[PDB]
Amino acid sequence: MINEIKKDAQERMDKSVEALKNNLSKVRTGRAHPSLLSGISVEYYGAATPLNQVANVVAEDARTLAITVFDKELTQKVEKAIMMSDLGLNPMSAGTIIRVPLPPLTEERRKDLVKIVRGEAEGGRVAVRNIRRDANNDLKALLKDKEISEDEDRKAQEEIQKLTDVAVKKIDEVLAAKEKELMEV
């Protein structure tokens, strides 16, 4: 059962990492990231529809987003949706294209978002550490039931340790990159 425990821990940590990245993607920076608008929804033929199903979102340049609405009848609803997302964005349209510049961060706002991303990172780290703790306890149960040897338990913990260190390093790197962007003035 050691292998099942290791694989489980690995899948759980990998997903904790993805969860962190997803969360950070919702944090606006001075740089263009189509992902920032992933949560945008527009009323289409009576139903709340994802932005990506009614338009393509691309980075025109490092600091500008370009949104092309496929149906000309949706351009203004899309634009309004963006203004409603309260991201401090000023979308401007023409035809089916909505240009959305990414404005620079004010000092006060930069320090606030840094706090937020560093806090999210810490959450990812505690998540991964909870998984290591949960996996190591599962190994202990086996050891104590005499299902695995002490040496197998110790080797397993070592592996768990490595999965932990990698996940945490991944989290630290993702944080660094995000802070680097936030520090851009």
Tell me the resolution in Å. 2.2
Which long-range contacts link 107-111 to residues 24+ away (Cβ below 8 Å)? 110/182, 110/183
Tokens of 57: 């979102």
Counting other chains too, the contacts that 118-124 makes at CB distance below 8 Å and 24 or more residues apart are 118/175, 118/179, 120/20, 120/23, 120/24, 121/20, 121/171, 121/172, 121/174, 121/175, 123/20, 124/16, 124/17, 124/19, 124/20, 124/171
| Number of domains making up the chain | 2
> Taking the chain, what is the end-to-end CA distance rounded to the nearest angstrom?
52
- Residue 115 has a CB neighbour count (10 Å cut-off) of 10
Q: Looking at the structure, do residues 170 and 122 belong to the same domain, yes or no? A: yes
57/33 Cα distance (integer angstroms): 9
Query: Are residue 101 and residue 42 in the same domain, yes or no?
Result: yes
The experimental technique behind this entry is X-ray
Please give the residue range of the domain that contains residue 147: 2-30+106-185
| Domain end position, chosen among 55, 72, 105 | 105
The last residue of a domain, from among 105, 139, 164? 105
Per DSSP, the three-state class of 87 is: coil
CATH code assigned at 64: 3.30.1360.40
